[PDB]
Structure 1
Amino acid sequence: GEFMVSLPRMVYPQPKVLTPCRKDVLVVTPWLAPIVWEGTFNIDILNEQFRLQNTTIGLTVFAIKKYVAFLKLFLETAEKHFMVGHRVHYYVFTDQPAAVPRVTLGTGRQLSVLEVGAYVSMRRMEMISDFCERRFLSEVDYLVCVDVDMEFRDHVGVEILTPLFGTLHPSFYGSSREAFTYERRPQSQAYIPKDEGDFYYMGAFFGGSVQEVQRLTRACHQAMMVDQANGIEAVWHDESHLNKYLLRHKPTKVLSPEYLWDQQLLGWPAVLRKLRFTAVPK
């Protein structure tokens, strides 16, 4: 859509058609979406492309009740690793604005504290889609929506940006679809039969353009409201609905488990060259 000026001259290694970047993993989905692993991207090319568009990335994070304790490490490590060099707007949703730590930000980065009422299962999807629609459309190009009980340990950058993305759940990337913990009751809007499903995406890291993220969160919120009216709560709450949405609306990139990992639970397997965004004990 938007007019893109030419890239400057760059000197980098030639990609070789008869040499894969990675032979140990699937790097493209069957609907031709890249699956983002280390070794698949030249970050210099991508940084150029996204800086030439003056890209602004919004990051939403919820810190309600005791989870305000996680904000200091989350934000300080985001400053070290998340979209460095690009414009970033953090949106911290909290019931305790005074408990938000004072974190020093790099240039071109800003943080907004958005107070929410105390307490729900629907809160994140509702808030991203019903309350913040207009603000996000005016302020950022992409939205990234993550859990707070996390820290950045390595690069998370513009390689993730695309109209719509989900992230492979670290516990299920090697699982067959029948083993996925999708909602299996046909009475739920999140229902997925045992013979359907591409991947099990984790609810803790998804994103896309503002328009696509509002579409996803609106759809998930509406589906959760239908379930509530029908007296059913999906097995994994908003994650169950996110999985149903991404089954029916294929993401345009999929992030590998580099982007959502728990080292205490799962170690550091050979397939992960980097642990980028990792669980903190809760």
Structure 2
Amino acid sequence: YPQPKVLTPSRKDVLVVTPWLAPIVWEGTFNIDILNEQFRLQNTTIGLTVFAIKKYVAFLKLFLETAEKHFMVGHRVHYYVFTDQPAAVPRVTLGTGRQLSVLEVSMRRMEMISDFSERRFLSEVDYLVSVDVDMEFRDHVGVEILTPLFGTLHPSFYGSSREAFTYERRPQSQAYIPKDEGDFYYMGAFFGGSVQEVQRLTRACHQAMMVDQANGIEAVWHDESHLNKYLLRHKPTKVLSPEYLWDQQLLGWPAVLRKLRFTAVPR
């Protein structure tokens, strides 16, 4: 219960709020005890979707074991594993209040989250988070991320000028973003929000991808390109810092990262 200090920035090295007043989530900006209590009072349930198709099933065991140690501990969690191999899903032991469902299955993540968010998820979960499976948790990822809509700063681009962002640059594409436009480059590997905002986003990105396909065009970075266009027009109500999406082998451990929470393991 340290008293917040009005005259001392929570960080002096990084931007902790966007120009539309969305928090940018970094270590030092939040008190987890306050936040945990706010979300427990609502009995919050968090859905986490992950796709593990073909060879990617090999990633699930470490993904699930580390999510058990770091993800939303103390809160209700429902993992949704989309896989082409139901029997290759490992039996990881889960903490109390946590469950896993197997859902048997470029355009494909968006469409499938969109279909299932309109069935099951509504309904089962208050927030939906969508990540890649070839990842491991190494530190706390909790209710600090939760908000109607969020994206995550891509670890390769957070220091970049917008012209260097690998947005879709061809105006023939639904994901087109002009050269003088763009707040941030968001990574496709970590986004989420309330179920409603997630249904809206994945529905938009899936509808935009079909339009692009009917026109014989594929956005340069696929659903990530559409994600960026969607979050340009519908601004996230929190942005995660790259603590939440890192590759240490590629990028090290710079000084602005006080924690590496969710990292790549060596669409």
What is the TM-score with the length of structure 2 in the denominator?
Answer: 0.99
Q: Distance in 2 between matches of 1:81 and 1:212?
A: 25
Mind listing any 5+ residue stretches in structure 2 that lack a counterpart?
Answer: none
Q: Distance in 2 between matches of 1:130 and 1:104?
A: 28
Following superposition of structure 1 onto structure 2, how do residues 215-226 of structure 1 map, counting pairs within 5 Å?
A: 215-226=200-211
* Corresponding residue of 1:6: none
SS of structure 2 residue aligned to 1:139: coil
How far 1:82 moved relative to its partner?
0.1
SS of structure 2 residue aligned to 1:203: coil
The number of residue pairs the alignment matches comes to: 267
* Corresponding residue of 1:101: 90
8 Å Cα contact 2:117-2:199 kept in structure 1: no
Structure 1 runs of 4+ aligned residues shifted over 2 Å read none
Superimposed CA distance per residue, residues 187-214 of structure 1 (whole angstroms, 9 cap, x where no aligned partner): 0000001100000000000000000000
How far 1:131 moved relative to its partner?
3.6
Which of 148, 151, 157 is matched with 2:142 structurally? 157
How far 1:181 moved relative to its partner?
0.1
Q: Distance in 2 between matches of 1:121 and 1:98?
A: 24
How far 1:77 moved relative to its partner?
0.1
- Residues 131 and 15 of structure 1, relative CA distance in 2, 3 Å threshold: closer
How far 1:39 moved relative to its partner?
0.3
8 Å Cα contact 2:117-2:195 kept in structure 1: no
Q: Distance in 1 between matches of 2:117 and 2:150?
A: 20
Superimposed CA distance per residue, residues 80-134 of structure 1 (whole angstroms, 9 cap, x where no aligned partner): 000000000000000000000010000000000000xxxx911110001124412
SS of structure 1 residue aligned to 2:122: helix
Q: Which moved more, 1:164-173 or 1:122-131?
A: 122-131
Q: Distance in 2 between matches of 1:223 and 1:82?
A: 31
Q: Which moved more, 1:122-131 or 1:46-55?
A: 122-131
Q: Distance in 2 between matches of 1:29 and 1:134?
A: 33
Q: Distance in 2 between matches of 1:132 and 1:70?
A: 24
How far 1:136 moved relative to its partner?
0.3
How far 1:157 moved relative to its partner?
0.1
SS of structure 2 residue aligned to 1:57: strand
How far 1:281 moved relative to its partner?
1.8
Structure 2 residue 27 is matched with structure 1 residue 27: no
Q: Distance in 2 between matches of 1:137 and 1:153?
A: 29
Which of 48, 59, 66 is matched with 2:55 structurally? 66
How far 1:246 moved relative to its partner?
0.1
Structure 2 residue 258 is matched with structure 1 residue 281: no
8 Å Cα contact 2:157-2:165 kept in structure 1: yes
How far 1:220 moved relative to its partner?
0.1
Q: Distance in 2 between matches of 1:94 and 1:132?
A: 16
Structure 2 residue 200 is matched with structure 1 residue 211: no
Structure 2 residue 33 is matched with structure 1 residue 48: no
Superimposed CA distance per residue, residues 145-203 of structure 1 (whole angstroms, 9 cap, x where no aligned partner): 00001000000000000000000000000000000000000000000011000000000
SS of structure 2 residue aligned to 1:129: helix
What is the TM-score with the length of structure 1 in the denominator?
Answer: 0.94
* Corresponding residue of 1:5: none
Q: Distance in 2 between matches of 1:130 and 1:103?
A: 26
Superimposed CA distance per residue, residues 17-41 of structure 1 (whole angstroms, 9 cap, x where no aligned partner): 0011101000000000000000000
SS of structure 1 residue aligned to 2:123: helix
8 Å Cα contact 2:16-2:23 kept in structure 1: yes
Q: Which moved more, 1:121-130 or 1:256-265?
A: 121-130
Identical columns (%)? 99
Following superposition of structure 1 onto structure 2, how do residues 76-225 of structure 1 map, counting pairs within 5 Å?
A: 76-115=65-104, 121-225=106-210
Q: Which moved more, 1:14-23 or 1:129-138?
A: 129-138
Superimposed CA distance per residue, residues 32-73 of structure 1 (whole angstroms, 9 cap, x where no aligned partner): 000000000000000000000000000000000000000000
SS of structure 2 residue aligned to 1:165: strand
SS of structure 1 residue aligned to 2:90: coil
Q: Distance in 2 between matches of 1:166 and 1:22?
A: 20
